[PDB]
């Protein structure tokens, strides 16, 4: 959010707002309550998370790299 670092400025380099939001809470509350589409988009967000965790623990076949 707030940035000084106080001597050798020279460049913006604001990862600081990206380390908190930079769009992520603002391009979310831009519109559209939905009130239940969070409950289904959180679920597939978790479902794709645990499926790729099952995928990366199932890569060892050969595939000839």
């Amino acid at each position: 959010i707030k940035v000084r670092e106080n001597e050798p400025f020279d460049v913006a380099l604001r990862r600081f707002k990206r380390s908190c939001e930079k769009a992520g809470v603002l391009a979310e509350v831009r519109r559209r309550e939905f009130y239940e589409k969070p409950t289904t988009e959180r679920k597939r967000a978790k479902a794709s998370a645990v499926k790729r965790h099952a995928k990366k623990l199932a890569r060892e076949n050969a595939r000839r790299t």
């Binding site: 809470v25 519109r31 309550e33």
Partner: protein
Amino acid sequence: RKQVSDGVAHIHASFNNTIVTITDRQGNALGWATAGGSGFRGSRKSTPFAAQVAAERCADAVKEYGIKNLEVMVKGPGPGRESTIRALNAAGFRITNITDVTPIPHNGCRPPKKRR
């Protein structure tokens, strides 16, 4: 003129348009310039370049005050942000500190339903 030395640059980088207002420390405005005022009516004002010329067109609107120290307050989602600060640095202002004052509610007002 009052000839103040230290000032605050506010940047209202919305999705459609960007407004660069340079004030003093207290908050009283000195001059401003938007992307719509610099030409660019329509799709062109929503680009980072129109934000850049809006900051330059605001820098020479406060030449009569002799500001040398600027603290930037960026606010908004728009593409203005990371280009309209660089235009103030090239304009010959010393960037004392940057902060984002983007108003994020602590969850309450119903946002619009819009845009299917």
